[PDB]
Amino acid sequence: MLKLIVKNGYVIDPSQNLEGEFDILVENGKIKKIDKNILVPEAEIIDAKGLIVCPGFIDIHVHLRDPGQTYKEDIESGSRCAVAGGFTTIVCMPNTNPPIDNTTVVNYILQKSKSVGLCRVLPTGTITKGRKGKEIADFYSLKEAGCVAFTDDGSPVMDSSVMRKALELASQLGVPIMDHCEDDSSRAPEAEEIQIARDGILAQRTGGHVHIQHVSTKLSLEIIEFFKEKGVKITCEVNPNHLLEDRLALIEGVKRGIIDCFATDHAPHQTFAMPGIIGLQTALPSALELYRKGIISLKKLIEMFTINPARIIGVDLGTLKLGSPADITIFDPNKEWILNEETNLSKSRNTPLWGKVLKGKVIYTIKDGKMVYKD
Numbered sequence: 001m002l003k004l005i006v007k008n009g010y011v012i013d014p015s016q017n018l019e020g021e022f023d024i025l026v027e028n029g030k031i032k033k034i035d036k037n038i039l040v041p042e043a044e045i046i047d048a049k050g051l052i053v054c055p056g057f058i059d060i061h062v063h064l065r066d067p068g069q070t071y072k073e074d075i076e077s078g079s080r081c082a083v084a085g086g087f088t089t090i091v092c093m094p095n096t097n098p099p100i101d102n103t104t105v106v107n108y109i110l111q112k113s114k115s116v117g118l119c120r121v122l123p124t125g126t127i128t129k130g131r132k133g134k135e136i137a138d139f140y141s142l143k144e145a146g147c148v149a150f151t152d153d154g155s156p157v158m159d160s161s162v163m164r165k166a167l168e169l170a171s172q173l174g175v176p177i178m179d180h181c182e183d184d185s186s187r188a189p190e191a192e193e194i195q196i197a198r199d200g201i202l203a204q205r206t207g208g209h210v211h212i213q214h215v216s217t218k219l220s221l222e223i224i225e226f227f228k229e230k231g232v233k234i235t236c237e238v239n240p241n242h243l244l245e246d247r248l249a250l251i252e253g254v255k256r257g258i259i260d261c262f263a264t265d266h267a268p269h270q271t272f273a274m275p276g277i278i279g280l281q282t283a284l285p286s287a288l289e290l291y292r293k294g295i296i297s298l299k300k301l302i303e304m305f306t307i308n309p310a311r312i313i314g315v316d317l318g319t320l321k322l323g324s325p326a327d328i329t330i331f332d333p334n335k336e337w338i339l340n341e342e343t344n345l346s347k348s349r350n351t352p353l354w355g356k357v358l359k360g361k362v363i364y365t366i367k368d369g370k371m372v373y374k375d
């Protein structure tokens with residue numbers, strides 16, 4: 001039983017431009033073969049008839065509240081949410097307490113993650129010691145310990161020279177800087193556009209990759225677009241749960257390919273990111289709504305959960321290439337269900353989709369060839 005066949009499914013791997021009725025053979029935690037009609041001895045068989053089989057989703061924006069606020073959420077609860085929403089890899093932000101600005105906390109997160117055993121949690125480092133804004137953190141030790149990106153998420157880097165130093169370091173190391181999330185002059189209405197343009201200008205001058213974690217306006221999207229054409233390494237994301245100057249422009253942004261990836265900004269709160277919502281477990285049905293309304297294809301939808309986020313944080317995931325690890329998500333685009341006390345795996349409930357009928361549900365999740373979630 002070292003061997004798994006996913007039979008009868010419809011496979012989509014945008015990374016390989018692969019779409020069709022194929023089977024998948026998994027040997028030794030890894031994709032061994034994709035082909036029609038696979039049958040081998042000593043193999044578990046999953047019948048994926050009527051299902052869609054794709055790479056495991058990757059969320060590059062999750063607040064796991066661990067260490068510190070583990071009553072809102074913790075590495076285990078988030079891990080469980082993640083795999084139930086189709087995610088085999090998640091990237092946690094560093095506004096923990098203590099913040100992730102030293103390798104002791106990096107290590108705590110990696111060790112906890114290995115023990116829960118469900119999805120692969122990749123930590124991020126703070127840009128500044130303390131997330132305080134003044135003193136730039138040790139990106140070399142933090143990346144070495146396992147951090148895949150840096151961000152001050154929950155108090156964005158105001159000082160424009162701090163941001164410039166961060167992107168220079170980032171470019172040496174080969175990792176993204178993530179800017180502009182709010183969570184736990186002054187507030188101009190166009191602060192966002194000015195910030196994105198600043199990050200663009202410093203990105204071009206430094207060679208550094210900047211990832212915008214929140215865009216709200218058409219002008220913002222046009223600015224991001226302008227710098228992509230100019231060859232600058234800038235990316236951005238959007239929360240599929242949030243799409244239910246304009247919300248209308250974001251949809252246009254997803255249509256036109258300006259927005260690189262989906263990311264939940266999963267943001268557990270215990271009263272009810274404004275102040276932000278949980279997302280992991282509903283990301284897919286939300287994003288399928290756009291697909292049912294003809295705004296994106298399924299290929300594009302899956303692109304934006306798999307290969308595209310993978311390329312931003314530079315890991316070799318989000319594919320079903322032969323040899324890659326067998327992170328596989330298997331979902332039914334047409335299964336109706338309800339997020340409520342019966343189904344919720346978060347310690348928090350803070351989402352406007354609570355109680356709503358959702359359409360699209362993950363049936364299996366597989367990490368490294370093992371079943372880590374089953375409906």
Ligand SMILES: [Zn+2]
Pocket residue numbers: 061063093153181182183265273
């Ligand atoms: Zn955030």
